[PDB]
Structures are given as C-alpha cells and as structure tokens.
C-alpha cells in the first residue's frame, strides 16, 4: 500500500536530500542493519549520524528494537539507494 | 606486530565483555563498516552504542574518517567475533 500522509518523508539541501530513517527487527539473527549502511554508502552519500541500539537493554517493557540514522544523498540518488533500504525494511518510518 | 601497551583493550561485566572500537577508511567505496555490525550481531552480543559518522563533513582540515561503537559479548565469544572485526580492520584501536 501507499500512505501519502505517512511519516516517511525527506528534504533537500544544496541540491541533495537530508533525512533520517528508523527500522527495527525481532529475533537475534535478523539484524542485517549492516546492509542498510551499504545503502547510504553505495551512492557516496554524506551520513550525518548513523546509529544502532536495540531497546530492552536500557529499558524493557515499553520500548522495542530500534536504529536511528541521518544521512544526505543527491535528491536523485536518494531514491536510488533508498530503494535498497526498502529492500531491507518496509514496515518502518523516517526519524 | 603485537603491541602490549597498545590502546586496544576491553573489560568484562557480569560474565561478558563490554568495550568500544573505532575504525576509519579512506576512499568512497571501501566503507564496509556494515560487516563490522555483523560481528557484534553474529554472536548475539549486546550493543550499547553503535555509531558511524565520517569526519570532514562537520570539520575538515584537522579530523578524519571515524566510526564509534560500544558493545558487549561473552568474555569468550568476544575474541570470537572480534577476530572478524580484525578481518575488517587492523590499523585502528578501541574507543
């Protein structure tokens, strides 16, 4: 489906797009967040703040797995590597 | 070579090891930091704070590429996945 009023959005700066993206995964093996960094790095984008820190550990019984990231990619290549990020996540949103 | 007084060290907590590791890479393609997250995740370790943010961008002409991370792994499996991390980096140190 395609939600227009969804949270996943972005902006452009100096001719590129600066945005953030979060994504979580259950289990203990499915943690291919690594492939996610391969995205922003594939189109030589400029990462602002890539971070990963599963929940529970700090507090448990309220939060859940997470992964905060901020990066910038040409307004055109964004959609390019983002597709990959869509290839890694789908049921999440931007930060 | 093997430097004993080197910076790369670690500690153990509750029967596991909690430490930090930094590593940098030049160019634009060699950014396989992703494989690094595959390490701490391979032995189901507990990551405290994994982060990546190349230098220059904030300030240039003093710093350089970097990648700060903090994670914990059984005092035994640490050496296990760290070897992998050694398979990704060698000329760097802990945080």
PDB file of C-alpha atoms in Angstrom:
ATOM      1  CA  UNK A   1       0.000   0.000   0.000  1.00  0.00           C
ATOM      2  CA  UNK A   2       0.952   3.659  -0.292  1.00  0.00           C
ATOM      3  CA  UNK A   3       0.199   6.060   2.552  1.00  0.00           C
ATOM      4  CA  UNK A   4       0.581   9.724   1.434  1.00  0.00           C
ATOM      5  CA  UNK A   5       0.146  11.125   4.934  1.00  0.00           C
ATOM      6  CA  UNK A   6       2.684   8.642   6.155  1.00  0.00           C
ATOM      7  CA  UNK A   7       5.676   9.580   8.256  1.00  0.00           C
ATOM      8  CA  UNK A   8       8.310   8.606   5.712  1.00  0.00           C
ATOM      9  CA  UNK A   9       9.430  11.895   4.187  1.00  0.00           C
ATOM     10  CA  UNK A  10      12.579  13.861   3.341  1.00  0.00           C
ATOM     11  CA  UNK A  11      14.003  17.275   2.439  1.00  0.00           C
ATOM     12  CA  UNK A  12      16.695  18.657   0.132  1.00  0.00           C
ATOM     13  CA  UNK A  13      19.714  20.720   0.910  1.00  0.00           C
ATOM     14  CA  UNK A  14      22.109  22.412  -1.524  1.00  0.00           C
ATOM     15  CA  UNK A  15      20.878  20.058  -4.242  1.00  0.00           C
ATOM     16  CA  UNK A  16      20.677  16.836  -2.242  1.00  0.00           C
ATOM     17  CA  UNK A  17      18.378  15.320   0.316  1.00  0.00           C
ATOM     18  CA  UNK A  18      18.911  15.238   4.038  1.00  0.00           C
ATOM     19  CA  UNK A  19      16.679  12.945   6.074  1.00  0.00           C
ATOM     20  CA  UNK A  20      16.502  10.240   8.738  1.00  0.00           C
ATOM     21  CA  UNK A  21      15.303   6.606   8.792  1.00  0.00           C
ATOM     22  CA  UNK A  22      14.488   4.177  11.594  1.00  0.00           C
ATOM     23  CA  UNK A  23      13.907   0.426  11.410  1.00  0.00           C
ATOM     24  CA  UNK A  24      13.621  -2.434  13.888  1.00  0.00           C
ATOM     25  CA  UNK A  25      13.932  -6.209  13.694  1.00  0.00           C
ATOM     26  CA  UNK A  26      12.969  -9.025  16.069  1.00  0.00           C
ATOM     27  CA  UNK A  27      14.796 -12.279  16.714  1.00  0.00           C
ATOM     28  CA  UNK A  28      18.551 -12.391  17.208  1.00  0.00           C
ATOM     29  CA  UNK A  29      19.814 -13.384  13.765  1.00  0.00           C
ATOM     30  CA  UNK A  30      17.809 -10.965  11.513  1.00  0.00           C
ATOM     31  CA  UNK A  31      19.948  -7.897  12.216  1.00  0.00           C
ATOM     32  CA  UNK A  32      21.078  -7.112   8.675  1.00  0.00           C
ATOM     33  CA  UNK A  33      21.169  -3.411   9.533  1.00  0.00           C
ATOM     34  CA  UNK A  34      24.631  -3.619   8.029  1.00  0.00           C
ATOM     35  CA  UNK A  35      23.167  -3.846   4.548  1.00  0.00           C
ATOM     36  CA  UNK A  36      21.412  -0.599   5.449  1.00  0.00           C
ATOM     37  CA  UNK A  37      24.713   1.273   5.803  1.00  0.00           C
ATOM     38  CA  UNK A  38      25.621  -0.207   2.416  1.00  0.00           C
ATOM     39  CA  UNK A  39      22.843   1.968   1.018  1.00  0.00           C
ATOM     40  CA  UNK A  40      23.923   5.444   2.051  1.00  0.00           C
ATOM     41  CA  UNK A  41      27.471   4.326   1.223  1.00  0.00           C
ATOM     42  CA  UNK A  42      26.646   2.890  -2.220  1.00  0.00           C
ATOM     43  CA  UNK A  43      25.822   6.294  -3.744  1.00  0.00           C
ATOM     44  CA  UNK A  44      28.606   8.002  -1.828  1.00  0.00           C
ATOM     45  CA  UNK A  45      26.075   9.952   0.228  1.00  0.00           C
ATOM     46  CA  UNK A  46      27.080  12.074   3.244  1.00  0.00           C
ATOM     47  CA  UNK A  47      25.991  10.489   6.501  1.00  0.00           C
ATOM     48  CA  UNK A  48      25.175  12.856   9.348  1.00  0.00           C
ATOM     49  CA  UNK A  49      24.579  10.398  12.182  1.00  0.00           C
ATOM     50  CA  UNK A  50      24.203   6.631  11.733  1.00  0.00           C
ATOM     51  CA  UNK A  51      23.402   4.775  14.944  1.00  0.00           C
ATOM     52  CA  UNK A  52      22.026   1.477  16.179  1.00  0.00           C
ATOM     53  CA  UNK A  53      20.997   0.471  19.683  1.00  0.00           C
ATOM     54  CA  UNK A  54      18.392  -2.257  20.387  1.00  0.00           C
ATOM     55  CA  UNK A  55      15.862  -1.473  23.060  1.00  0.00           C
ATOM     56  CA  UNK A  56      15.078  -3.555  26.140  1.00  0.00           C
ATOM     57  CA  UNK A  57      18.652  -3.303  27.217  1.00  0.00           C
ATOM     58  CA  UNK A  58      18.236   0.261  28.631  1.00  0.00           C
ATOM     59  CA  UNK A  59      14.562  -0.236  29.446  1.00  0.00           C
ATOM     60  CA  UNK A  60      12.286  -3.180  28.806  1.00  0.00           C
ATOM     61  CA  UNK A  61       8.516  -3.439  28.925  1.00  0.00           C
ATOM     62  CA  UNK A  62       7.759  -0.274  26.982  1.00  0.00           C
ATOM     63  CA  UNK A  63      10.183   0.262  24.042  1.00  0.00           C
ATOM     64  CA  UNK A  64      11.459  -2.058  21.302  1.00  0.00           C
ATOM     65  CA  UNK A  65      14.316  -2.656  18.844  1.00  0.00           C
ATOM     66  CA  UNK A  66      15.409   0.489  17.005  1.00  0.00           C
ATOM     67  CA  UNK A  67      18.030   2.019  14.713  1.00  0.00           C
ATOM     68  CA  UNK A  68      18.371   5.806  14.276  1.00  0.00           C
ATOM     69  CA  UNK A  69      20.155   7.222  11.213  1.00  0.00           C
ATOM     70  CA  UNK A  70      20.634  10.546   9.458  1.00  0.00           C
ATOM     71  CA  UNK A  71      22.192  10.940   6.027  1.00  0.00           C
ATOM     72  CA  UNK A  72      22.147  13.024   2.854  1.00  0.00           C
ATOM     73  CA  UNK A  73      22.069  11.908  -0.776  1.00  0.00           C
ATOM     74  CA  UNK A  74      21.544  13.762  -4.063  1.00  0.00           C
ATOM     75  CA  UNK A  75      17.808  14.386  -4.405  1.00  0.00           C
ATOM     76  CA  UNK A  76      18.064  11.891  -7.266  1.00  0.00           C
ATOM     77  CA  UNK A  77      20.355   9.171  -5.884  1.00  0.00           C
ATOM     78  CA  UNK A  78      18.390   9.234  -2.679  1.00  0.00           C
ATOM     79  CA  UNK A  79      15.504   7.403  -4.223  1.00  0.00           C
ATOM     80  CA  UNK A  80      18.239   5.250  -5.728  1.00  0.00           C
ATOM     81  CA  UNK A  81      19.752   3.857  -2.549  1.00  0.00           C
ATOM     82  CA  UNK A  82      16.526   4.237  -0.578  1.00  0.00           C
ATOM     83  CA  UNK A  83      15.041   1.542  -2.791  1.00  0.00           C
ATOM     84  CA  UNK A  84      17.706  -0.669  -1.334  1.00  0.00           C
ATOM     85  CA  UNK A  85      16.736   0.464   2.103  1.00  0.00           C
ATOM     86  CA  UNK A  86      13.227  -0.549   1.117  1.00  0.00           C
ATOM     87  CA  UNK A  87      14.844  -3.836   0.205  1.00  0.00           C
ATOM     88  CA  UNK A  88      15.991  -4.072   3.827  1.00  0.00           C
ATOM     89  CA  UNK A  89      12.949  -2.562   5.557  1.00  0.00           C
ATOM     90  CA  UNK A  90       9.309  -1.813   4.739  1.00  0.00           C
ATOM     91  CA  UNK A  91       7.226  -1.704   7.932  1.00  0.00           C
ATOM     92  CA  UNK A  92       9.106   1.261   9.418  1.00  0.00           C
ATOM     93  CA  UNK A  93       9.364   5.040   9.034  1.00  0.00           C
ATOM     94  CA  UNK A  94      11.718   8.005   8.934  1.00  0.00           C
ATOM     95  CA  UNK A  95      13.173   9.629  12.038  1.00  0.00           C
TER      96      UNK A  95
ATOM     97  CA  UNK B   1      53.186  -6.972  15.163  1.00  0.00           C
ATOM     98  CA  UNK B   2      51.786  -7.116  18.683  1.00  0.00           C
ATOM     99  CA  UNK B   3      51.817  -4.016  20.878  1.00  0.00           C
ATOM    100  CA  UNK B   4      51.087  -4.893  24.554  1.00  0.00           C
ATOM    101  CA  UNK B   5      50.856  -1.268  25.660  1.00  0.00           C
ATOM    102  CA  UNK B   6      48.544  -0.621  22.771  1.00  0.00           C
ATOM    103  CA  UNK B   7      45.200   1.093  23.122  1.00  0.00           C
ATOM    104  CA  UNK B   8      43.087  -1.872  22.072  1.00  0.00           C
ATOM    105  CA  UNK B   9      41.737  -3.285  25.323  1.00  0.00           C
ATOM    106  CA  UNK B  10      38.488  -4.423  26.950  1.00  0.00           C
ATOM    107  CA  UNK B  11      36.739  -5.256  30.229  1.00  0.00           C
ATOM    108  CA  UNK B  12      34.213  -7.814  31.475  1.00  0.00           C
ATOM    109  CA  UNK B  13      30.861  -7.322  33.060  1.00  0.00           C
ATOM    110  CA  UNK B  14      28.600  -9.938  34.662  1.00  0.00           C
ATOM    111  CA  UNK B  15      30.493 -12.623  32.750  1.00  0.00           C
ATOM    112  CA  UNK B  16      30.869 -10.868  29.402  1.00  0.00           C
ATOM    113  CA  UNK B  17      32.995  -8.129  27.949  1.00  0.00           C
ATOM    114  CA  UNK B  18      31.990  -4.543  27.447  1.00  0.00           C
ATOM    115  CA  UNK B  19      34.226  -2.388  25.273  1.00  0.00           C
ATOM    116  CA  UNK B  20      34.420   0.059  22.368  1.00  0.00           C
ATOM    117  CA  UNK B  21      36.091   0.005  18.925  1.00  0.00           C
ATOM    118  CA  UNK B  22      36.852   2.702  16.363  1.00  0.00           C
ATOM    119  CA  UNK B  23      37.964   2.315  12.748  1.00  0.00           C
ATOM    120  CA  UNK B  24      38.310   4.580   9.725  1.00  0.00           C
ATOM    121  CA  UNK B  25      38.550   4.055   5.976  1.00  0.00           C
ATOM    122  CA  UNK B  26      39.567   6.320   3.090  1.00  0.00           C
ATOM    123  CA  UNK B  27      38.138   6.443  -0.415  1.00  0.00           C
ATOM    124  CA  UNK B  28      34.401   6.381  -1.042  1.00  0.00           C
ATOM    125  CA  UNK B  29      33.753   2.728  -1.856  1.00  0.00           C
ATOM    126  CA  UNK B  30      35.688   0.979   1.000  1.00  0.00           C
ATOM    127  CA  UNK B  31      33.071   1.600   3.693  1.00  0.00           C
ATOM    128  CA  UNK B  32      32.321  -1.994   4.664  1.00  0.00           C
ATOM    129  CA  UNK B  33      31.605  -0.880   8.227  1.00  0.00           C
ATOM    130  CA  UNK B  34      28.442  -2.877   7.730  1.00  0.00           C
ATOM    131  CA  UNK B  35      30.372  -6.120   8.021  1.00  0.00           C
ATOM    132  CA  UNK B  36      31.530  -4.727  11.361  1.00  0.00           C
ATOM    133  CA  UNK B  37      27.986  -4.708  12.763  1.00  0.00           C
ATOM    134  CA  UNK B  38      27.746  -8.295  11.510  1.00  0.00           C
ATOM    135  CA  UNK B  39      30.359  -9.107  14.138  1.00  0.00           C
ATOM    136  CA  UNK B  40      28.682  -7.976  17.337  1.00  0.00           C
ATOM    137  CA  UNK B  41      25.461  -9.390  15.865  1.00  0.00           C
ATOM    138  CA  UNK B  42      26.927 -12.779  14.880  1.00  0.00           C
ATOM    139  CA  UNK B  43      27.470 -13.902  18.490  1.00  0.00           C
ATOM    140  CA  UNK B  44      24.247 -12.280  19.644  1.00  0.00           C
ATOM    141  CA  UNK B  45      26.190  -9.738  21.693  1.00  0.00           C
ATOM    142  CA  UNK B  46      24.512  -6.744  23.373  1.00  0.00           C
ATOM    143  CA  UNK B  47      25.368  -3.497  21.634  1.00  0.00           C
ATOM    144  CA  UNK B  48      25.465  -0.388  23.805  1.00  0.00           C
ATOM    145  CA  UNK B  49      26.012   2.306  21.181  1.00  0.00           C
ATOM    146  CA  UNK B  50      26.959   1.627  17.551  1.00  0.00           C
ATOM    147  CA  UNK B  51      27.577   4.766  15.513  1.00  0.00           C
ATOM    148  CA  UNK B  52      29.217   5.931  12.311  1.00  0.00           C
ATOM    149  CA  UNK B  53      29.902   9.460  11.115  1.00  0.00           C
ATOM    150  CA  UNK B  54      32.740  10.319   8.682  1.00  0.00           C
ATOM    151  CA  UNK B  55      34.762  13.381   9.518  1.00  0.00           C
ATOM    152  CA  UNK B  56      35.408  16.372   7.268  1.00  0.00           C
ATOM    153  CA  UNK B  57      31.722  16.939   6.963  1.00  0.00           C
ATOM    154  CA  UNK B  58      31.452  18.670  10.400  1.00  0.00           C
ATOM    155  CA  UNK B  59      35.019  19.965  10.295  1.00  0.00           C
ATOM    156  CA  UNK B  60      37.743  19.434   7.733  1.00  0.00           C
ATOM    157  CA  UNK B  61      41.463  20.074   7.942  1.00  0.00           C
ATOM    158  CA  UNK B  62      42.030  18.511  11.348  1.00  0.00           C
ATOM    159  CA  UNK B  63      39.966  15.302  11.850  1.00  0.00           C
ATOM    160  CA  UNK B  64      39.395  12.237   9.660  1.00  0.00           C
ATOM    161  CA  UNK B  65      37.000   9.354   8.946  1.00  0.00           C
ATOM    162  CA  UNK B  66      35.738   7.622  12.088  1.00  0.00           C
ATOM    163  CA  UNK B  67      33.258   5.102  13.489  1.00  0.00           C
ATOM    164  CA  UNK B  68      32.460   4.911  17.227  1.00  0.00           C
ATOM    165  CA  UNK B  69      30.922   1.742  18.693  1.00  0.00           C
ATOM    166  CA  UNK B  70      30.227   0.196  22.082  1.00  0.00           C
ATOM    167  CA  UNK B  71      29.097  -3.382  22.602  1.00  0.00           C
ATOM    168  CA  UNK B  72      29.275  -6.346  24.969  1.00  0.00           C
ATOM    169  CA  UNK B  73      29.987 -10.001  24.222  1.00  0.00           C
ATOM    170  CA  UNK B  74      30.681 -13.026  26.432  1.00  0.00           C
ATOM    171  CA  UNK B  75      34.309 -12.776  27.550  1.00  0.00           C
ATOM    172  CA  UNK B  76      34.780 -15.828  25.328  1.00  0.00           C
ATOM    173  CA  UNK B  77      32.722 -15.004  22.223  1.00  0.00           C
ATOM    174  CA  UNK B  78      34.218 -11.554  22.224  1.00  0.00           C
ATOM    175  CA  UNK B  79      37.509 -12.804  20.927  1.00  0.00           C
ATOM    176  CA  UNK B  80      35.321 -14.847  18.601  1.00  0.00           C
ATOM    177  CA  UNK B  81      33.604 -12.035  16.731  1.00  0.00           C
ATOM    178  CA  UNK B  82      36.458  -9.598  17.325  1.00  0.00           C
ATOM    179  CA  UNK B  83      38.580 -11.773  15.061  1.00  0.00           C
ATOM    180  CA  UNK B  84      36.075 -10.890  12.404  1.00  0.00           C
ATOM    181  CA  UNK B  85      36.415  -7.271  13.317  1.00  0.00           C
ATOM    182  CA  UNK B  86      40.130  -7.817  12.851  1.00  0.00           C
ATOM    183  CA  UNK B  87      39.116  -9.203   9.491  1.00  0.00           C
ATOM    184  CA  UNK B  88      37.543  -5.812   8.767  1.00  0.00           C
ATOM    185  CA  UNK B  89      40.091  -3.552  10.476  1.00  0.00           C
ATOM    186  CA  UNK B  90      43.670  -3.776  11.751  1.00  0.00           C
ATOM    187  CA  UNK B  91      45.276  -0.319  11.816  1.00  0.00           C
ATOM    188  CA  UNK B  92      42.824   1.106  14.366  1.00  0.00           C
ATOM    189  CA  UNK B  93      42.103   0.980  18.102  1.00  0.00           C
ATOM    190  CA  UNK B  94      39.396   0.770  20.742  1.00  0.00           C
ATOM    191  CA  UNK B  95      37.332   3.748  21.868  1.00  0.00           C
TER     192      UNK B  95
END
